[PDB]
Amino acid sequence: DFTQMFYNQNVKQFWLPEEIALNGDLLTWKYLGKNEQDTYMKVLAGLTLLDTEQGNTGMPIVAEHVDGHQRKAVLNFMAMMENAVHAKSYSNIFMTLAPTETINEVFEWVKQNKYLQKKAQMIVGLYKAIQKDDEISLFKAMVASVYLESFLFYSGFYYPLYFYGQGKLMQSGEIINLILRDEAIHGVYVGLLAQEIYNKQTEEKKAELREFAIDLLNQLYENELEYTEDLYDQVGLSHDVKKFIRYNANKALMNLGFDPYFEEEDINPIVLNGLKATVEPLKDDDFYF
Amino acid sequence: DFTQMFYNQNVKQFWLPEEIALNGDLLTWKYLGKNEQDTYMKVLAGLTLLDTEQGNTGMPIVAEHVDGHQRKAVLNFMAMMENAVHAKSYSNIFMTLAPTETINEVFEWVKQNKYLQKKAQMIVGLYKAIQKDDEISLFKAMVASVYLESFLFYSGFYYPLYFYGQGKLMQSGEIINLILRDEAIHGVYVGLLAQEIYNKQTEEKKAELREFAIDLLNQLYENELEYTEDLYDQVGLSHDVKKFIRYNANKALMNLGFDPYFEEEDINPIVLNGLKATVEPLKDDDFYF
Amino acid sequence: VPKWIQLNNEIMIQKDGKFQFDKDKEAVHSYFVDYINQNTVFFHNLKEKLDYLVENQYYEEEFLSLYSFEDIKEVFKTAYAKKFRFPSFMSAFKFYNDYALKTNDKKKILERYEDRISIVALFFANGDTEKAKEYVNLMINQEYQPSTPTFLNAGRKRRGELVSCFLLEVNDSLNDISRAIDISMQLSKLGGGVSLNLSKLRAKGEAIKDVENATKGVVGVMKLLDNAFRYADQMGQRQGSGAAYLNIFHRDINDFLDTKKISADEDVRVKTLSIGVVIPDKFVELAREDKAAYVFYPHTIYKEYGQHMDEMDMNEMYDKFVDNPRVKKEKINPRKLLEKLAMLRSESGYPYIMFQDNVNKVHANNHISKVKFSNLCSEVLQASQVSSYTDYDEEDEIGLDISCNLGSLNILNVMEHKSIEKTVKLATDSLTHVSETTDIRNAPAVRRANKAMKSIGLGAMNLHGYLAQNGIAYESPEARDFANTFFMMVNFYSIQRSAEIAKEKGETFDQYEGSTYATGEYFDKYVSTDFSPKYEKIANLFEGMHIPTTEDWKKLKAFVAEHGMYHSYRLCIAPTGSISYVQSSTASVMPIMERIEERTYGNSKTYYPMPGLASNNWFFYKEAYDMDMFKVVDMIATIQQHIDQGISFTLFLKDTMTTRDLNRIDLYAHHRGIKTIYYARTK
Amino acid sequence: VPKWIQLNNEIMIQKDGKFQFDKDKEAVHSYFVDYINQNTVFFHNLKEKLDYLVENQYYEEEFLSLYSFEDIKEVFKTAYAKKFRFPSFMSAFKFYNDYALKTNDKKKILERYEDRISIVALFFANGDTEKAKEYVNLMINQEYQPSTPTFLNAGRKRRGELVSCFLLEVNDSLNDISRAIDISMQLSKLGGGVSLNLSKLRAKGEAIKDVENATKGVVGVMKLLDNAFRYADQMGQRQGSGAAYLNIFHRDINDFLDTKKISADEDVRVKTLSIGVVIPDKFVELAREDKAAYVFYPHTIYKEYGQHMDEMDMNEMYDKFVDNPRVKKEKINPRKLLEKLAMLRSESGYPYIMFQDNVNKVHANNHISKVKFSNLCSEVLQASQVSSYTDYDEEDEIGLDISCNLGSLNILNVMEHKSIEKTVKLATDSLTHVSETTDIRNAPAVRRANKAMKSIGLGAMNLHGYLAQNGIAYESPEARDFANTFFMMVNFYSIQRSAEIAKEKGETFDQYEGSTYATGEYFDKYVSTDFSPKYEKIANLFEGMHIPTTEDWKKLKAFVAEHGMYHSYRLCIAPTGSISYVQSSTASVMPIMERIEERTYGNSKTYYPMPGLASNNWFFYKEAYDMDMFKVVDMIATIQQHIDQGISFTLFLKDTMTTRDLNRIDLYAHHRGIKTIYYARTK
Numbered sequence A, B: 001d002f003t004q005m006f007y008n009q010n011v012k013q014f015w016l017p018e019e020i021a022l023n024g025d026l027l028t029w030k031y032l033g034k035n036e037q038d039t040y041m042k043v044l045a046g047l048t049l050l051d052t053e054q055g056n057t058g059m060p061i062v063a064e065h066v067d068g069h070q071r072k073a074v075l076n077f078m079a080m081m082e083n084a085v086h087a088k089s090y091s092n093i094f095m096t097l098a099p100t101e102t103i104n105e106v107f108e109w110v111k112q113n114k115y116l117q118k119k120a121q122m123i124v125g126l127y128k129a130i131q132k133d134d135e136i137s138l139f140k141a142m143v144a145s146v147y148l149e150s151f152l153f154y155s156g157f158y159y160p161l162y163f164y165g166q167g168k169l170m171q172s173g174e175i176i177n178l179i180l181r182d183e184a185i186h187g188v189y190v191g192l193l194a195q196e197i198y199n200k201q202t203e204e205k206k207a208e209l210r211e212f213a214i215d216l217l218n219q220l221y222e223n224e225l226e227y228t229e230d231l232y233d234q235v236g237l238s239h240d241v242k243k244f245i246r247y248n249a250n251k252a253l254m255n256l257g258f259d260p261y262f263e264e265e266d267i268n269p270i271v272l273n274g275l276k277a278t279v280e281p282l283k284d285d286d287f288y289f
Numbered sequence C, D: 001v002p003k004w005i006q007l008n009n010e011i012m013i014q015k016d017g018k019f020q021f022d023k024d025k026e027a028v029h030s031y032f033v034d035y036i037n038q039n040t041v042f043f044h045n046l047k048e049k050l051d052y053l054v055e056n057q058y059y060e061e062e063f064l065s066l067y068s069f070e071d072i073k074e075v076f077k078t079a080y081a082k083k084f085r086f087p088s089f090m091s092a093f094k095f096y097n098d099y100a101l102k103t104n105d106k107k108k109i110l111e112r113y114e115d116r117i118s119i120v121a122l123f124f125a126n127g128d129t130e131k132a133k134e135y136v137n138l139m140i141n142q143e144y145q146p147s148t149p150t151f152l153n154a155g156r157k158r159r160g161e162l163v164s165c166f167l168l169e170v171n172d173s174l175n176d177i178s179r180a181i182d183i184s185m186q187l188s189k190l191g192g193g194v195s196l197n198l199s200k201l202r203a204k205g206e207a208i209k210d211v212e213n214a215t216k217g218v219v220g221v222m223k224l225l226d227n228a229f230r231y232a233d234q235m236g237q238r239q240g241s242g243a244a245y246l247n248i249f250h251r252d253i254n255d256f257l258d259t260k261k262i263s264a265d266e267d268v269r270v271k272t273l274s275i276g277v278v279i280p281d282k283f284v285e286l287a288r289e290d291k292a293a294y295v296f297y298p299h300t301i302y303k304e305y306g307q308h309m310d311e312m313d314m315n316e317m318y319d320k321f322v323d324n325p326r327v328k329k330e331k332i333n334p335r336k337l338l339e340k341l342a343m344l345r346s347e348s349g350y351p352y353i354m355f356q357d358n359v360n361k362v363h364a365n366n367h368i369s370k371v372k373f374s375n376l377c378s379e380v381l382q383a384s385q386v387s388s389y390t391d392y393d394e395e396d397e398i399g400l401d402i403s404c405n406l407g408s409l410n411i412l413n414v415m416e417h418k419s420i421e422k423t424v425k426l427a428t429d430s431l432t433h434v435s436e437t438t439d440i441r442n443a444p445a446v447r448r449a450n451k452a453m454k455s456i457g458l459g460a461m462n463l464h465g466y467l468a469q470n471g472i473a474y475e476s477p478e479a480r481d482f483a484n485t486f487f488m489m490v491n492f493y494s495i496q497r498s499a500e501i502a503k504e505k506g507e508t509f510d511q512y513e514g515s516t517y518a519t520g521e522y523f524d525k526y527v528s529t530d531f532s533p534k535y536e537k538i539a540n541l542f543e544g545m546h547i548p549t550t551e552d553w554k555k556l557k558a559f560v561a562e563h564g565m566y567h568s569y570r571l572c573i574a575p576t577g578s579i580s581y582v583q584s585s586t587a588s589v590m591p592i593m594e595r596i597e598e599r600t601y602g603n604s605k606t607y608y609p610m611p612g613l614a615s616n617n618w619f620f621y622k623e624a625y626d627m628d629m630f631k632v633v634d635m636i637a638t639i640q641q642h643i644d645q646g647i648s649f650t651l652f653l654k655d656t657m658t659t660r661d662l663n664r665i666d667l668y669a670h671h672r673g674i675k676t677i678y679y680a681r682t683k
């Protein structure tokens, strides 16, 4: 009942980072403190890693196991967006704002950062555990994918949105909003596929799947807290970001058909403010007036 | 040396089925004989069936085994074009020209056809034989992929190009020309990835891989001749189609860095009208002798 | 954020449900109280100012030496006696950011508006103090505005040429192609926009010295020209702008057009080279009847007939070309080509469309040559003769390359002063002076045609502004009636001034005797059709001004017969990009694109309402995109019937309309006599 | 597959563990008894053949009209009396595919090897039957080989130019840049490779008439030249090849080099224009001492001193440039620049390296000008004076643009016939004739330099072939001794022929009086040092030939002082790429790249063994990549000491070695006196 409308929405949202000129951010970037620039680079690098694995591994593997040519076409399109559009856009931002050495250093930093490695290990592990014709392993990977789309990106998204909302780094911010618009529909779509599998189960099996989903969320959440503190303490924003990730965790649960897990909190209003032509042939009557 | 350049060319060639209005083809379709309509339907179904294998297996399997983030992104983009763009385009052409019952029957016929099946299963067999961390099996699959993209499609493309060059079925011919333009670049790109593997091999292993490629080409070519007579004798075109197959076989070989196999021939003019050394610092005393 | 910028952004803040337009005026005051006066260099007297500007190589000594200091001081006093005030912030901002003379360090303002106007007037008068005062009164009343080159550079030593529209003919040879590249580079160095005709160039796959499939076509020449224009970019100030025109019957026309497709490869697409397509009536007839057309190889036609394909009338030559076996041609579908043109214009606004027969059925100088192509702005339409640039140490055959002189009447200011005649004649005199003082030593055909043809372009602007401030809709028949009458008077007084200059100097333009002015044919429609307003409102608008009748036109025809005409071409309506801001006017005769335009300068936002915009005339200031393009075509044709050259005519389309609508607008423009179509701007 | 193709492929099928080289001979027989004799066009006699080739616009009738038909018949009979047989299939294949004259549709062969040689000899002799027979005997014995342009185009109506390479000096002006682009297109149209010195062009960020940071630098001119060479690509047959040379002290030297980086952006990357770097001894000295160097802005130096930066000696003016505050400069690391050069040469083989001081310490015409750049093959090193191309209607100051005619001695055939003297003199006469009959009507500086300098290039081929076929290792000291003696003999007889031509014509080259030939300095090392072979084997190789001693050199010096020299430059060793196949010779004086080369033609593959390769001389035919590049540098320096121009010295590198090894090879070449380095080809 939904794939065709997701297909149409995904293809109509198609974009490339080159559509957005980035040289306009040069001055507001220059004006940020060293702490702010450091957090910003690292935040986008963490996002790049997530999209790299979502594009290389997550979306293609889910596409392989989901039945139906139209469902596969949507998932293939989403996979392309992850690595050919999203992951690449971050390099466009980096290449504009930062010198090569700072770019090299931040990519080295992703390799050695323990929270980023842990979250990649956990998510990719679940993707690679999918067994052919085994719907339960597939469900588990789809939960992981929804948590990546609708929860894990958000510790990263906070900062570009926080600046966009203050009228700073608005070109980079425009790219990020386009990425976020895509991930929101990706999380909903994968969520609907996960619910399909969940709804086939006995009540006993469902109870176990909820346990899996909640245990996984808590494990990812605890790691994300440490990651958030590590990045944001130097810019004074860790508590604010934590509220934001809890907000988005609830959205991820909802995408999976589950009740919200965290209590509602006031999000920084700045971040809330951060949120060919048709052709006809010529008739013989068009030549006369 | 080449992936970013191909990335650029691929993404700038992006298109969607909806861009070409198909209904005006009915004004020339109605004037074709039964044999012409039959051949066109059968050719179209042949292309559709082969392209589906490439979207579901060929491109995603190569993307899975190739190392490199940028290569995986380009390959993902190509897989997307197969599943999201090409497959929808072929379906659109069919739905415009034939009623539902006729489409189902043509696909039943082509699905049972000996020559279409022989080539489809030969290609799919090589994709299924790729082994993790075995570059020889990957190379063999890449050869199969290049043969599909740059050679096997062309016994089929001939007919839409033949009409397109005569002013018949111009809307579907425009679509086919866009598809063909994508398959050309797909073949060239996968060809470069195969040459990379080939160049890492010993001289004896190279000679063995050359023998594999020529032997495979021979098997496919002999089946193409039979496929060609089976479809095109009823419309009197087989002689010219055979010249077009050999010409495209030579292009496929050149994509794989191999010499042409067949003598140069002229093509039907109607179809033509349709168509890093190690950096070591100077240590001083290198200026004295 | 500066105070004037806050006062300007306060316009959008609505009070009582209305825009605070008057706040803009306050912004101007702030922009002068806080910035302009603080950063304006002041001198104890005008003598010290002139000495400082001349000594520091700001001005030229020659034009100031023609007057005594008392006369220059009197001209400056006449300029300052008006007490001119910019009515909007954007007018003063555009003048003091683009045209006001600044120090070498670009931190101080040496020229006010009155100073620049006085200097331009003194340059125009060429030693006549009374004429200089007349020019000062013309420009300080803002009745006439010299073009951006003339207004910016007149009287300045560190300057480019006063002409920025150049049309080059390229002959089918490597020597001619290299010379065209060189001349394009030299003219872009001077700051001018260069248009090149590529129709004489042989297509791709033609023979060079009887070796087959050797020519690269016009696309390689376009790549060379694009590189030349990228290299010559006004000493790294503005992006080098060039245009290439190809006849639609040239075989390369598709590849030509393919240079503007987004899917085109890097070796095919030209980015800084605008493209225009010349469409003869034969192509429109072939598309209308759905007959398949033929695109011809120019070199085969030249070999068979001894003349270039674009040098003969395709209406009578097309059948002979098709039936000639020695002429090589390719089959095309003209309707498919029209759809491709519409699609390309939807994507990028290219190509410019030149309706060759629409231009040449009213062209007065067809004996010299038929108009084969237009300029970068698609409004200059003049006879051009190709040059034969031979090898070294061999004499070149210098032809005629078009370079007309731009200047725009402010229709609102001209008509409220009831001074159509005086403004037109003074503008013609100033354009004649600038054409006579132009000497380009690296473009031989441009210089020869400037000396011979003496062609000038007198344009108009603020048409929509004038109509909206007078309660007239741009699409109304009353607006077309006003345009007809106003531009007929402009043509009448331009012809009268040209004939008066010819009588005074005793010379006409070269080959005038063969022109329709000499034979009296040009005045036919003027001696038989009365162009007085048909509506009482327009007649009351023209009250206080003598409207030339048929008897007046007969007298003018007799005067031209007796004395000749000094200018081969007089009127052309240029887009008038930035000078419309300084004059507080709507751009050209085009309808306004937006009622209030939002711009970003530096990191600051600014708001420019259209001149005279208020609550009462908000409805009359209809946006161009909301307008019916057929009625815009009707108005532009009404104006074009009184303009000897073309009008920069931009189409304003909505994203909803398809390529069929664009093609319909183009075909209605062709039917209504539109000479050129400039751009297809999609909202 | 053809029978000759199978016979040629039978070489690699080993019999008893040995290659079947003799099968190659069989292939040629097949290639003649199945293809060439059937595809040749035979006439009843030579009269009908000559008439058919003359009326059908295959041959120029002027050069044939200087002989009676009896003399032409005698020349052709002399050519055919040798019964010349191609010893390898690839020799005949290359001649009949690249140099034999074919019909208009290229379906039949009109020219045999003897016919082509006879036509070239008749063109060379210019009406002298005995001289024509001498040329026929020289070429049919394959002692001398005219360059590909001369051999292919001599006596042909549809011919191009006989000059292979052209060198242009580009002055720092838009007029000069446009003229350079035009001349480059004209000379690429003529088929010649064009080299342009961009060192006089001011760098990026320089002032164009007091507006600063305006110039695009040499990279914009590089892009313009790249597009010009792409457009002028020999009518689409051979890709247009150009070379740009920049001094290493130019500020743009990095950006220059960045044009060849594989990661360069499209707006900077240049792909059809080869790059060369001119390195004075000052740069090598700065890199050796690790002192930070300074690259300079040419326009500031020209303003301060009145001369261009490359117009004067950097070794004496570098400190003055650095200490001058009015000269603008940028700090660079010379060792980092050297490492960048090595990395670029490893990646792409660019830039060409020209050691300016090595060229000019032995340059005989420093009075006319110092050698500031080289040609596309980096072997032409001649004085050039820049031209002042002024505005239109202004006279241009025409300078000297280098251009020389190429011709190679076949060392094996010359020494086998014991005819160094006769071959050198006849080749000098043929090159003098080629220079005299060369008249280029679109390159004025090239024409003036050809008329004044009278420079020719007499190269040599089959050095490695002769050494390997005589049991001498190319890296051995005996090989260097042979090269020393042979090229001293070549220089002696070339100087003797030049002086004899000057005596017989009563004229020398322009400004000869200031040259080292006139002052006798050039002969210093020849009148004090004996260049006779130091090894008995080499002396036996030179038996039957009078090796010039110091007394003969003193007599030649006196003869030159009395009569002068006709040619400013005589000897230059070109790469001799494809014409070495026809002569059955190794390419130039370079060592062989491979013993048997596998080349793909059409859908077939062919194997060409090196000339004379066999079991007994397999290891004497050592591959260049396996050789020590230091000993190859020693050989090239030994040859270079007797060559007035340069030698196209290609470096042959292994993949294992680093950029430090490449830098060491370059520095050893500079130390040993190597003038230019052509390519860094990595295996």
Ligand SMILES: Nc1ncnc2c1ncn2[C@@H]1O[C@H](COP(=O)(O)OP(=O)(O)OP(=O)(O)O)[C@@H](O)[C@H]1O
Binding pocket: C028, C029, C032, C033, C037, C084, C085, C086, C087, C092
């Ligand atoms: N809208 C405006 N357009 C142009 N110049 C202006 C404008 N407003 C102020 N100025 C400049 O600032 C000066 C101060 O003008 P203001 O409105 O204070 O009164 P004023 O009576 O015109 O003054 P002044 O004694 O300078 O003539 C003007 O003379 C003029 O040079």
Ligand SMILES: Nc1ncnc2c1ncn2[C@@H]1O[C@H](COP(=O)(O)OP(=O)(O)OP(=O)(O)O)[C@@H](O)[C@H]1O
Binding pocket: D028, D029, D032, D033, D037, D084, D085, D086, D087, D092
């Ligand atoms: N290697 C070769 N190089 C050049 N021409 C050749 C070669 N081989 C054969 N030909 C040409 O083909 C002809 C075939 O004759 P072939 O060499 O077999 O000997 P033939 O008939 O005894 O006569 P002859 O050797 O005296 O010409 C030759 O006369 C010559 O014109």
Ligand SMILES: Cc1cn([C@H]2C[C@H](O)[C@@H](COP(=O)(O)OP(=O)(O)OP(=O)(O)O)O2)c(=O)[nH]c1=O
Binding pocket: C189, C231, C232, C233, C234, C235, C236, D171, D172, D173, D174, D175, D177, D201, D202, D207, D208, D209, D210, D214, D215, D216, D217, D220
């Ligand atoms: C016109 C122009 C010149 N140049 C550079 C290239 C030329 O080598 C250099 C000289 O140009 P010139 O033609 O000599 O300009 P000019 O003579 O008017 O200025 P000047 O008196 O200082 O010589 O300027 C550009 O880079 N871009 C351009 O558009």
Ligand SMILES: [Mg+2]
Binding pocket: C172, C173, C174
């Ligand atoms: Mg010509």
Ligand SMILES: [Mg+2]
Binding pocket: D172, D173, D174
């Ligand atoms: Mg100059």
Ligand SMILES: [Mn+2]
Binding pocket: A051, A054, A081, A082, A086, A087, A179, A182, A183
């Ligand atoms: Mn993503």
Ligand SMILES: [Mn+2]
Binding pocket: A054, A078, A082, A149, A182, A183, A186, A187
């Ligand atoms: Mn996603």
Ligand SMILES: [Mn+2]
Binding pocket: B051, B054, B081, B082, B086, B179, B183
């Ligand atoms: Mn496909």
Ligand SMILES: [Mn+2]
Binding pocket: B054, B082, B149, B182, B183, B186
């Ligand atoms: Mn494909």
